[PDB]
């Protein structure tokens with residue numbers, strides 16, 4: 001068995017490197033292409049920068065996270081922005097109900113590798129249950145070539161395709177960057193991970209961007 005529940009709750013209570021204060025750039029590029037339609041589910045939402053950006057762009061949004069501290073943070077930023085159309089709830093992405101056929105777009109911003117491999121089927125069944133016909137699904141996930149076997153369940157391209165294609169029609173899988181703001185000396189000196197330094201004091205690690213739709 002494995003569980004990261006306590007770690008995520010502690011990180012949110014205190015800032016997490018992944019809470020970059022904006023949607024992940026790879027996902028913001030899909031938003032500007034018009035790929036996010038209707039009601040949006042931000043699954044494993046964390047502080048929910050992408051929900052909040054979509055709720056500013058006319059969408060009704062729902063963010064789900066297993067961490068109560070993440071949900072508090074997302075609600076607190078929605079309050080600062082006066083955003084009545086963004087809502088958040090504590091829920092397990094691998095086993096949630098209450099949204100049958102609701103969402104036209106479901107976005108997984110780095111939740112995928114944050115649950116055990118054995119929870120993926122339940123998670124994929126749960127988001128399909130919450131999806132309206134023809135819904136789009138976008139996943140940003142770490143690459144197993146960058147993140148090893150351990151607490152994080154990063155994926156190879158073939159592994160990701162095999163898991164998701166059982167439930168969705170895949171349109172594209174391509175290499176992507178996952179951005180973060182890491183502390184100085186993160187993962188050692190020399191570093192044990194390949195962390196790319198980016199402009200604006202950000203960093204990135206290799207991943208995959210998957211685009212799919214309900215068949």
Ligand SMILES: Nc1ncnc2c1ncn2[C@@H]1O[C@H](CSCC[C@H](N)C(=O)O)[C@@H](O)[C@H]1O
Nearest residue numbers: 008044045046065066067092093109111114
């Ligand atoms: N089973 C599960 N159900 C729901 N959320 C989960 C979960 N397992 C992990 N999470 C959440 O998945 C998130 C991964 S970190 C990414 C958070 C956010 N999407 C962003 O891009 O900033 C965490 O907030 C963690 O609490």
Ligand SMILES: O=c1[nH]cc(O)c2ccccc12
Nearest residue numbers: 017018110114152178179180
């Ligand atoms: O899941 C993660 N754990 C710890 C990190 O610092 C991190 C940084 C970026 C993205 C994801 C993660």
Ligand code: NA
Nearest residue numbers: 031034036057
């Ligand atoms: Na939009």
Ligand code: NA
Nearest residue numbers: 004114115116
């Ligand atoms: Na988890």
Ligand code: NA
Nearest residue numbers: 174175176177
């Ligand atoms: Na690219």
